[PDB]
C-alpha cells in the first residue's frame, strides 16, 4: 500500500493510441505489441504513454468509460445501489490521474470528468464506512465486495483489521 506500488500493478493495463512514426530503428519487440506505423491506432500498455506523450512523439486517446453521459447515469444508478455499482476496469482511479496529468494538451473535457469521478468516489467511500456502523458480532463470514474496486480499499486496510482480529476475538 502506497501511491505508486499499485501502479506497478495498475499501469500495466491497456489503451490504444496512434503514434507518428514508421517502424523504429527496431521495428517491434517480441511480444503482444503490434506493428508501428504512423497514421493508425496501436494498442499499448501505460508505461509508455507517459514515456511517449512527453517525448513529443504522438497523440493519445482514452477508453470509452471516460465520458460525461455514462458517468452521469452511473451515479444515479449508484444512488439506489444499496450494495455497489458499475465498474469500468476496476482500477480506473489511477488511469485517470496518469491520463489527465499529461494528456490534456489535446484531450477534451478535462475537468468535468474530474468533477464526476470524484462525485462517485466520495459517495462510494462514505458508503464503505457504513458497512462498519452495522458490522456486528464479529461477522467474519459476511461482507461486501460484489462490485467493489481496489483503489479505495487500501484506504481502510491497515486501520481496522490489524487490530480487529485480536480485539473482537471475544466472540
Amino acid at each position: 500500500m502506497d501511491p505508486s506500488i499499485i501502479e506497478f500493478i495498475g499501469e500495466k493495463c491497456m489503451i490504444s493510441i496512434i503514434p507518428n512514426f514508421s517502424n523504429e530503428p527496431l521495428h517491434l519487440i517480441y511480444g503482444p505489441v503490434g506493428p508501428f506505423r504512423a497514421g493508425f491506432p496501436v494498442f499499448v500498455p501505460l508505461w509508455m504513454a507517459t514515456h511517449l506523450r512527453k517525448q513529443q512523439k504522438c497523440r493519445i486517446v482514452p477508453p470509452e468509460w471516460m465520458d460525461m453521459d455514462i458517468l452521469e447515469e452511473i451515479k444515479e444508478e449508484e444512488k439506489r445501489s444499496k450494495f455497489f455499482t458499475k465498474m469500468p476496469c476496476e482500477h480506473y482511479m489511477v488511469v485517470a490521474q496518469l491520463v489527465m496529468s499529461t494528456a490534456p494538451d489535446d484531450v477534451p473535457r478535462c475537468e468535468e470528468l474530474r468533477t464526476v469521478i470524484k462525485d462517485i468516489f466520495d459517495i462510494r467511500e462514505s458508503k464503505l464506512r457504513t458497512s462498519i456502523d452495522a458490522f456486528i458480532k464479529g461477522e467474519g463470514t459476511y461482507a461486501k465486495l460484489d462490485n467493489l474496486t481496489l483503489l479505495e480499499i487500501h484506504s481502510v486496510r491497515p486501520i481496522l483489521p490489524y487490530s480487529l482480529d485480536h480485539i473482537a476475538r471475544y466472540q
Partner: protein, 203 residues
Amino acid sequence: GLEDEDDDDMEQITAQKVLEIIETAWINEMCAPEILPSQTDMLELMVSQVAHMEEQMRDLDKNDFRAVVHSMELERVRYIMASYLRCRLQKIETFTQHILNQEESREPDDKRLSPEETKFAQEFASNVDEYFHKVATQYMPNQEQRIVTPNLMSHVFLKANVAVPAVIVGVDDEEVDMAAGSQHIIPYQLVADLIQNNQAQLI
C-alpha cells in the same frame, strides 16, 4: 513426455505471461500472516529470458528508443523480483523460530521453502547466540517460549474466482455464498486450503 508446456518447453512464453505466472505468488505473499509455498523455477526462468534479451539489445546497443524500452521493462521485472524476495527475507528474519519445526516435520520439496533460505536461517540462529556471547555466556542460562510469527487469524480480503453459487469446500466456518466476482470476508486459519489449490486469491 507431454511437452508444449508453459514452463521452459517447446513453445514461446511471453514476457507478459511470465509477468502473470508469479504476479499472484507475490501479491498473496504481500498481505498474509505467515510464509507461503516457495518457487525456484523463476531463477533459470528470469535470467534465461533476461540474458537473451539483454544480449539481443547489446547487438543493437546504439538506438535511443528500443534499448530504453527493453530496459524499462527489465527494470519493472527486477522491481517485482526484488520485492518478492525482500518480503520473504523479512518474514523469515522474523519467523526464524518455529518455521524450523515444520521443516523438521518433513523438509518439504520446492512447495514450502527453498534451500538458501535455510542457509540464512541457520546462519542467523547461530549468530544471535554467538552475539549473545558477550552478554551472558560465562553465565548463560543454566537450563520453548520464544516464538515470533504464529498467528493465523489476521483478517484478509479474498477474491473468489469460481462458481457463482456457493462452492462449499474445506474451511471451518459457514463459507456459504461463494461467487465468481464477490467475497464474504474471513480470516486465514480456516483458509490456507483454497489458496494452495489456486482456487481463490487475495488482494
